[PDB]
């Protein structure tokens, strides 16, 4: 069934697994009419799909054309989500396919569990961690793929750069999390954090900056402080 | 008017024949049951005073033949039989009715509830449901399990109800995922109705036949497939008018039936808030929300 802080470890086996994240499918600006009234514009979303052994993220960019016409949104976006993670595992070979799917949000677990019906050996898995993927459109490049495209697109990235070349996927995700976290509670600050120091560049084959694993260790800090500050702060503690 | 006479009642037992009940004593004189209206399947249940668990019972058609009731002290119940030899058994119910040993089938002439619980039911179908084709009555007990139940052990004593399942190939045409789980009139009326049932009325037949084991013997299986067929029509947006004026006539008299305090174990709380006040047919089951608000309040 869920998974939790109990069963963590079980991420980073042997067995292929994704995590699915739907929170930045559907994406509105709010705003008045001439008449006064409310109205929405959808922009740009992505399926957030990601790999947590290997950092290989499944970006699938959403296109404000495949709402048009289109009633209950909020509803359909599980669904369009649910066709596009099938439409991608049909399209990976047998030995790429997940044993697993884990979604970050419960309202994914019946839309994608009945896309799966041909999959009956792939678990569908709901989590009791509270992960931080919503913040992905925090990341510039993958904020500039989804905002430039002009039609439906898949885009493949590892969202750990080289980092297994030197650390285990276990810490690759705890880095990943801790940044994500950090831009999700204070963005201006953690990229500040990020590019404060113009020295260290993001390789244009990059998401993140070059940093050696003792200016890492110095970010690392600098993010737990930032979360720590922030929780203060919003609960006055 | 039939009946069905009993060999003699060795063991003290609550007998139930359809909605009406008796407690017999153990070696009471008790010879069984007259006035057994023609026209309707009817059941005749058991509860031992000395094991309040296996409610047990029989399905029968007195158009279908001669049926007594014999207790077995070897397999510890009161089994149905057929007594082939017309005279024999014209004799024996002659001697049991001029003693007078035989309880009467206590309708009330005004009283519609049998027909209106048994309206689609026919024998033929519960023999399909109650696989046991050397007797032309069915046995049913608490404790038997569904084939839907068993996939998810023993197939010769399982209730072979129409497997329903809303997240299943059956249900979900390929590239109508969305539109076939939120609209279930494709289920229904494609694949349940013209498919399998054939007409709403076998359709009704099982369901009627579902509530009816869920209430007389507890039978959880049945419950979930009662449910089950009720939510599959309230989930549908297309349903023809007759079936939803039929429906709501059918649940109305099982919901006045049901045992005030039986509607913790025998209704599903979630099945019925969806059916009445979320569902497509939430408007369209009057009788029956009515009388739901008026006696079950506290489930909604």
Same mark, same amino acid.
């Given at each position: 069934?869920?998974?939790?802080?109990?069963?963590?470890?079980?991420?980073?086996?042997?067995?292929?697994?994704?995590?699915?994240?739907?929170?930045?499918?559907?994406?509105?600006?709010?705003?008045?009419?001439?008449?006064?009234?409310?109205?929405?514009?959808?922009?740009?979303?992505?399926?957030?799909?990601?790999?947590?052994?290997?950092?290989? %993220?499944?970006?699938? /960019?959403?296109?404000?054309?495949?709402?048009?016409?289109?009633?209950?949104?909020?509803?359909?976006?599980?669904?369009?989500?649910?066709?596009?993670?099938?439409?991608?595992?049909?399209?990976?070979?047998?030995?790429?396919?997940?044993?697993?799917?884990?979604?970050?949000?419960?309202?994914?677990?019946?839309?994608?569990?009945?896309?799966? %019906?041909?999959?009956?050996?792939?678990? /569908?898995?709901?989590?009791?961690?509270?992960?931080?993927?919503?913040?992905?459109?925090?990341?510039?490049?993958?904020?500039?793929?989804?905002?430039?495209?002009?039609?439906?697109?898949?885009?493949?990235?590892?969202?750990?750069?080289?980092?297994?070349?030197?650390?285990?996927?276990?810490?690759?995700?705890?880095?990943?999390?801790?940044?994500?976290?950090?831009?999700?509670?204070?963005?201006?600050?953690?990229?500040?954090?990020?590019?404060?120091?113009?020295?260290?560049?993001?390789?244009?084959?990059? %998401?993140?900056?070059?940093?050696?694993?003792?200016?890492? /260790?110095?970010?690392?800090?600098?993010?737990?402080?930032?979360?720590?500050?922030?929780?203060?702060?919003?609960?006055?503690? | 008017?039939?009946?069905?006479?009993?060999?003699?009642?060795?063991?003290?037992?609550?007998? &139930?024949?359809?909605?009406?009940?008796?407690?017999?004593?153990? $070696?009471?004189?008790?010879?069984?049951?007259?006035?057994?209206?023609?026209?309707?399947?009817?059941?005749?249940?058991?509860?031992?005073?000395?094991?309040?668990?296996?409610?047990?019972?029989?399905?029968?058609?007195?158009?279908?033949?001669?049926?007594?009731?014999?207790?077995?002290?070897?397999?510890?119940?009161?089994? +149905? +039989?057929?007594?082939?030899? &017309?005279?024999?058994?014209?004799?024996?119910?002659? $001697?049991?009715?001029?003693?007078?040993?035989?309880?009467?089938?206590?309708?009330?002439?005004?009283? @519609?509830?049998?027909?209106?619980?048994?309206?689609?039911?026919?024998?033929?179908?519960?023999?399909?449901?109650?696989?046991?084709?050397?007797?032309?009555?069915?046995?049913?007990?608490?404790?038997?399990? *569904?084939?839907?139940?068993?996939?998810?052990?023993?197939?010769?004593?399982? !209730?072979?109800?129409?497997?329903?399942?809303?997240?299943?190939?059956?249900?979900?045409?390929?590239?109508?995922? +969305?539109? @076939?789980?939120? @609209?279930?009139?494709?289920?229904? $009326? *494609?694949?349940?109705?013209?498919?399998?049932?054939?007409?709403?009325?076998?359709?009704?037949?099982? !369901?009627?036949?579902?509530?009816?084991?869920?209430?007389?013997? &507890?039978?959880? &299986?049945?419950?979930?497939?009662?449910?089950?067929? #009720?939510?599959?029509?309230?989930?549908?947006?297309?349903?023809?008018?007759?079936?939803?004026?039929?429906? @709501?006539? #059918? !649940?109305?008299?099982?919901?006045?039936?049901?045992?005030?305090?039986?509607?913790?174990?025998?209704?599903?709380?979630?099945?019925?808030?969806?059916?009445?006040?979320?569902?497509?047919?939430?408007?369209?089951?009057?009788? *029956?929300?009515?009388?739901?608000?008026?006696?079950?309040?506290?489930?909604?």
């Amino acid at each position: 069934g869920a998974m939790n802080s109990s069963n963590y470890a079980e991420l980073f086996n042997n067995d292929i697994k994704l995590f699915v994240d739907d929170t930045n499918v559907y994406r509105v600006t709010v705003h008045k009419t001439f008449e006064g009234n409310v109205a929405t514009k959808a922009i740009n979303g992505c399926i957030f799909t990601l790999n947590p052994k290997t950092g290989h %993220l499944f970006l699938k /960019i959403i296109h404000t054309s495949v709402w048009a016409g289109q009633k209950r949104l909020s509803q359909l976006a599980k669904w369009k989500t649910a066709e596009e993670v099938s439409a991608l595992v049909r399209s990976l070979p047998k030995e790429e396919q997940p044993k697993q799917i884990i979604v970050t949000r419960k309202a994914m677990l019946d839309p994608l569990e009945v896309h799966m %019906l041909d999959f009956p050996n792939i678990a /569908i898995r709901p989590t009791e961690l509270r992960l931080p993927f919503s913040a992905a459109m925090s990341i510039d490049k993958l904020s500039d793929v989804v905002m430039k495209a002009t039609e439906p697109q898949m885009v493949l990235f590892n969202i750990y750069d080289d980092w297994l070349d030197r650390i285990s996927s276990y810490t690759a995700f705890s880095r990943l999390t801790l940044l994500l976290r950090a831009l999700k509670t204070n963005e201006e600050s953690a990229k500040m954090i990020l590019l404060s120091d113009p020295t260290i560049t993001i390789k244009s084959y990059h %998401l993140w900056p070059s940093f050696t694993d003792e200016q890492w /260790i110095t970010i690392e800090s600098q993010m737990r402080d930032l979360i720590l500050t922030e929780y203060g702060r919003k609960y006055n503690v | 008017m039939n009946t069905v006479p009993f060999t003699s009642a060795p063991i003290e037992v609550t007998i &139930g024949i359809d909605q009406y009940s008796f407690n017999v004593k153990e $070696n009471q004189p008790f010879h069984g049951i007259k006035d057994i209206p023609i026209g309707h399947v009817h059941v005749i249940h058991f509860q031992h005073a000395d094991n309040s668990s296996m409610r047990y019972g029989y399905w029968f058609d007195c158009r279908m033949g001669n049926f007594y009731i014999q207790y077995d002290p070897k397999d510890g119940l009161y089994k +149905m +039989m057929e007594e082939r030899d &017309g005279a024999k058994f014209e004799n024996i119910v002659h $001697n049991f009715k001029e003693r007078q040993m035989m309880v009467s089938y206590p309708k009330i002439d005004e009283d @519609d509830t049998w027909y209106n619980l048994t309206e689609f039911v026919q024998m033929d179908k519960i023999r399909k449901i109650v696989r046991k084709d050397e007797n032309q009555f069915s046995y049913v007990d608490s404790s038997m399990t *569904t084939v839907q139940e068993n996939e998810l052990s023993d197939p010769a004593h399982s !209730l072979n109800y129409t497997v329903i399942n809303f997240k299943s190939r059956e249900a979900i045409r390929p590239g109508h995922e +969305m539109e @076939d789980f939120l @609209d279930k009139s494709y289920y229904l $009326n *494609t694949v349940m109705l013209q498919g399998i049932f054939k007409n709403s009325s076998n359709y009704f037949g099982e !369901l009627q036949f579902a509530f009816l084991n869920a209430m007389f013997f &507890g039978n959880y &299986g049945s419950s979930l497939q009662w449910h089950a067929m #009720i939510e599959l029509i309230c989930s549908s947006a297309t349903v023809p008018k007759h079936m939803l004026d039929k429906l @709501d006539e #059918i !649940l109305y008299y099982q919901i006045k039936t049901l045992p005030e305090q039986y509607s913790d174990i025998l209704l599903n709380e979630r099945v019925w808030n969806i059916c009445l006040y979320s569902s497509f047919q939430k408007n369209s089951l009057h009788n *029956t929300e009515k009388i739901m608000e008026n006696k079950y309040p506290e489930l909604l």
